[PDB]
């Protein structure tokens, strides 16, 4: 007997079919608009959607006024409305079903540095995140996957401690600034 957990799960399911012609074209432009790095990445935005959607059909089997459905209603909904996927005027949960993969893929921080007046291309953004430049209320995220809260969005910026913000000159600017002193002498 030991003092540990063993606990974990996977996050992605792989499609029953291999070598299709209608699917091989449509997952590869999810890699263009937003700038993802492999399939795996994509496959899990779905699995999280798929998960939401099966619980919704679980609740719709129940009657109205059934106290589980009301409570677990609210929760399932607000859980999509603190992060702006659903909108205020769709409390009702038919509306949860008619709800697709592109709205999740643009909450991801990667996409949230392309759109806000602080990155030139999208494929620049997944290299600003990972070179530890940008931050979200005095706290540095290093992780595109970060799904973003709708409370936060007005607080994203360049971190204080940075050459692309306030700070001291860098590795390669300061070296060829230091090289100009070494050359003239």
């Amino acid at each position: 007997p030991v003092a540990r957990s063993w606990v974990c799960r996977k996050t992605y399911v792989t499609p029953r079919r291999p070598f299709e012609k209608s699917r091989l074209d449509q997952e590869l432009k999810l890699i263009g608009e937003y700038g993802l790095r492999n399939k795996r990445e994509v496959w899990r935005v779905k699995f999280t959607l798929a998960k939401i959607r099966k619980a919704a059909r679980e609740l719709l089997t129940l009657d109205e006024k059934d106290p589980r459905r009301l409570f677990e209603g609210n929760a399932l909904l607000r859980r999509l409305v603190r992060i702006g996927v659903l909108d205020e005027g769709k409390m009702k949960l038919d509306y949860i079903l008619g709800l697709k993969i592109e709205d999740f893929l643009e909450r991801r921080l990667q996409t949230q540095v392309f759109k806000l007046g602080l990155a030139k291309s999208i494929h620049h953004a997944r290299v600003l995140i990972r070179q530890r430049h940008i931050r979200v209320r005095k706290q540095v995220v290093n992780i595109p996957s970060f799904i973003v809260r709708l409370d936060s969005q007005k607080h994203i910026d360049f971190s204080l401690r940075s050459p692309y913000g306030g700070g001291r000159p860098g590795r390669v600017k300061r070296k060829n600034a230091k090289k100009g002193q070494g050359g003239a002498g």
Partner: protein, 124 residues
């Protein structure tokens, strides 16, 4: 520009001490040494640095902020009394003996053979 703030304060009458969660802000430099941290509490609580004990500091990604669980006592007399040994050894006032638990188990099982006031001769 090093700044301390305490957090969750309590007093044990029945262990003879102040305890609290010391909280640090340090933008710009490496995490800080404890003979600096101690002596900065000492005019937060106007004692000497001697009695106070601060251990454990987890730091924060992005740089900035660390979190400790320091505790302040009344007199030195008591400070040896009601507190661990390792958390005196650090401050230079306790020293355990010079045999790790290889030696000492070999020497128990040779006393276990010998009988009576013959047991003292196996030990020198």
């Amino acid at each position: 520009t090093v700044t301390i703030r305490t957090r969750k304060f309590m007093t044990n009458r029945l262990l003879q001490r102040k305890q609290m969660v010391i909280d640090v802000l340090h933008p710009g430099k490496a995490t800080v040494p404890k003979t600096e941290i101690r002596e900065k509490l000492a005019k937060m609580y106007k004692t000497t640095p001697d009695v106070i004990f601060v251990f454990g500091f987890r730091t924060h990604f992005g740089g900035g902020k660390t979190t400790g669980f320091g505790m302040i006592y009344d007199s030195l007399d008591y400070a040896k009394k009601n507190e661990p040994k390792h958390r005196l050894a650090r401050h230079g006032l306790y020293e355990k003996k010079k045999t790790s638990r290889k030696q000492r188990k070999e020497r128990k099982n040779r006393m276990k053979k010998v009988r009576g006031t013959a047991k003292a001769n196996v030990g020198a």
